[PDB]
Amino acid sequence: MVKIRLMRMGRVHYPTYRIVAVDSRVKRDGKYIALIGHLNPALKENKCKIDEAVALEWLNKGAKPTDTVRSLFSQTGLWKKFVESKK
Amino acid sequence: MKRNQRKVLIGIVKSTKNAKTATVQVESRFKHPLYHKSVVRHKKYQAHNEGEVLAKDGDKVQIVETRPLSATKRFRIAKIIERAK
Amino acid sequence: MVSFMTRLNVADNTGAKQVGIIKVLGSTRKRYAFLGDVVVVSVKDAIPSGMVKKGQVLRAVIVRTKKGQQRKDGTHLKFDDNACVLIKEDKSPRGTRIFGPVARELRERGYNKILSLAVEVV
Amino acid sequence: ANIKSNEKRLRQNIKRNLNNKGQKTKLKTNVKNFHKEINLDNLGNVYSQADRLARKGIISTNRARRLKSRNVAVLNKTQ
RNA sequence: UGUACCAUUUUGAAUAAGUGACGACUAACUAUGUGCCAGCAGUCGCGGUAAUACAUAGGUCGCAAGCGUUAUCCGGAUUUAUUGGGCGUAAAGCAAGCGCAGGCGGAUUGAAAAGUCUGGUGUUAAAGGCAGCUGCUUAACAGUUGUAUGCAUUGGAAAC
RNA sequence: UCUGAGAGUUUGAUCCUGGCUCAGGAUUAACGCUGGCGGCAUGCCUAAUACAUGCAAGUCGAUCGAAAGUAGUAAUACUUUAGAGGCGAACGGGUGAGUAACACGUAUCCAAUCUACCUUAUAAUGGGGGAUAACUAGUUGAAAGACUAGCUAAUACCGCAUAAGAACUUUGGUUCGCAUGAAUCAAAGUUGAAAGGACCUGCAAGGGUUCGUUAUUUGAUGAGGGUGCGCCAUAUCAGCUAGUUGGUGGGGUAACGGCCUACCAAGGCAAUGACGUGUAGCUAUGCUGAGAAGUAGAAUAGCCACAAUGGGACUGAGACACGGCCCAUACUCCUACGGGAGGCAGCAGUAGGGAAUUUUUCACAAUGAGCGAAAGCUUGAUGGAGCAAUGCCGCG
RNA sequence: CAAGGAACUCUGCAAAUUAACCCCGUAAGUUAGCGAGAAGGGGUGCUUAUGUAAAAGUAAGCCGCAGUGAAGAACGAGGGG
């Protein structure tokens, strides 16, 4: 029940996220298993320096993304590679 | 096949006065945290002489751990070099 | 019928395990104390975490008797141990709870607080 | 100081306990009857009750397996 | 949240300075009062009628929206000294001996490889640590990449 | 490529041994004086003391009967939810009382284990039956409720037919292992499944997507056990241990195991510190030091333990369950005197202790969780805003 | 002899409790011999079976308010002269 999801590690009035593979029952901002890549709500462009390597391994393993997590994958195009690799 | 390998320990028998037992003693040379000198220790593990191994007192015996057969017994005897006493 | 120098139990939370009667209060040569009677007592067996200390002279009212007494209808109420609870001048219990059952003779002689703090009246 | 979910859960588990206890008692009486007057016939009934309970979860699957293996050992020894 | 911020928007220096110390360690001194009295003090110590050490005042110095005092931890302290101390006269050689276990230990050869050294792999969670960079008016701060330490296993070295 | 500052003080004066004090940092800090603002962060160290009051885990009508409301002549259409059922309530949040040992850190072996939902792959999802919530009526009550008799529904429950594969054995082969021992067959015997919902098409018959279900398969996550090493003070604590040590057969546990049982024995640990006493959550880390290391385990993060005190168990993939259940103890409160109610070490706040540490706040808007197809819904986690020169930084 | 239990009296005088056997456990002090039957507790009947030379004991069952069912069997602790 690994779940690629976010983790807030910014400061007051300035969030900062990191895509990460973690279990569902682990608290947010806690212990995790593997690092994918970071995010910034105000990076203008390239807001999601993705990895494109282990992420495909964990999704193939069966990781369940989230709504905002999925969103990031689509603008780069990671959803395409995952679904076509399934096929 | 590929089978994870168990840990081994080489020791000497100190006493044997029960049914199927052998109180072996294993030594080690752990360093000292501050004065940095080797110190000889002594700890007495127990094992079972199920058979074919006997290993009476004074017999230099090698020891491999095993699933706990009982409380305080988690080791088994094996090959015996320098059979004496 | 509790009499002079009678050891009896306390049915409340106050730290007093054994209490000894000193005087059967009420008149001259009052021989016995029946249910509802007030007596002067001395704490003899107490506990460290108790409001009373060993040796204090205090006033108590009896609630149970081994001998028992007979009511007007003919019913004879009889307990298995003599018990008393420590009371204050106002007739208000010193403890915050009462253990075990109590008689109905208390109701006649006031003692409404004792009845309301009991487990069940008999 | 109380939650309807917790209250409802307590009310449901009383009924579940009744039903599961009935099922467990049948297995207990059946294995005792079997080993009483030993007979290869009974053995079958033992399998049916143990496997069914194991699927429903009422009994841990491992306990059914150990009971099954051990009861079959008695028959082979006696036959 | 009509919040940060912005503008040639009105008024206008207007709405804003305290605390410790001044004999030495320790940058900074005079007068008045008191007269072993009243008081100060982290240490040495000041006060007995000419007090730069007390009280007040003026001056001056150290700090600053903070300044002093108190409490606790570390350093300085080589003042429990493995690194890194001593035992004649300053603290410290038992009154002396026989001595098991422990520690140490002559020379040469062979083997093994437990110490010892080295290569490969795994791991030592993330934050923090140090270096670089970015973003907040720069900073504090946040993010970013880099950055060891030990353990286990395996392959070699053979001087002690 | 690391990298270290001293001074005062015994004497009439000097040298040395030697103790005391100071110059530097630092804190969950407090007190006195004073006091303008902004950006970050911190904020009961004590009484794991007791708590007023209000909030802190629910969700699905696309599982099911019924009821209610609004429109409609009617058939019916829409909305709402007390109850049955599924799922989640074991996550998340708080505190550090207990605990000196496999608790924890590290490395490991689980030929001695579990894992619901999730991943891959593979067979089925046919047909019956008996019940009870809601409702009605009666008794008992102010009400909470409780008891009694009838009425219904299903993805609730219980049989039956059926096994691609499963589980337990039997027959001999295979490949063997680290001692118990695993690994693979071919044949056979024995045993064992469930449930439908939404929508589309089709005159119909039938067909179809999707959710969901049973039986398996792959992994992964999470949980559990054992072991080596490391991990406080004290000898002005020297013996301790009788399920303690071992074997046998049996029972139990997810599993090995004196975990339990009956028998047979007398061992095990201990001066290389047992046992006892006192103390303490451990670790990554914080402060300090040139370094070796000393010191505290703020905040936060990993692991353990706890939920007024002490025990037991149900349900479940997972609890012996903070705001579930049962019992006892202590404490408080309500009553119409028969009976009951309660657990702020969840967010605030109150009383008390203290030298001393804050809103009885707003919103799920972002992140996160639980249920749902969505609409959504619930989130004192979380995100903000108050408060305080509490610390760093900046400007007047 | 119901309730109380030394309130009686110069004084627990007298009376009352315990009492046999078997199985647990037993302190301060000491001249190391004792204290000590210390203190404090438990079981006892009948039947069946197993145990033995006989037992004692062990397991199951039965009855009564009570089972050395009656007789005979030590009350104890602490301080002082």
Ligand SMILES: [Mg+2]
């Ligand atoms: Mg053995």
Ligand SMILES: [Mg+2]
């Ligand atoms: Mg179960």
Ligand SMILES: [Mg+2]
């Ligand atoms: Mg002064």
Ligand SMILES: [Mg+2]
């Ligand atoms: Mg002056």
Ligand SMILES: [Mg+2]
């Ligand atoms: Mg020092």
Ligand SMILES: [Mg+2]
């Ligand atoms: Mg030092």
Ligand SMILES: [Mg+2]
């Ligand atoms: Mg010296």
Ligand SMILES: [Mg+2]
């Ligand atoms: Mg000398």
Ligand SMILES: [Mg+2]
């Ligand atoms: Mg000499």
Ligand SMILES: [Mg+2]
């Ligand atoms: Mg001498």
Ligand SMILES: [Mg+2]
């Ligand atoms: Mg000599």
Ligand SMILES: [Mg+2]
């Ligand atoms: Mg020697």
Ligand SMILES: [Mg+2]
């Ligand atoms: Mg790290």
Ligand SMILES: [Mg+2]
């Ligand atoms: Mg940072």
Ligand SMILES: [Mg+2]
């Ligand atoms: Mg001098």
Ligand SMILES: [Mg+2]
């Ligand atoms: Mg200083």
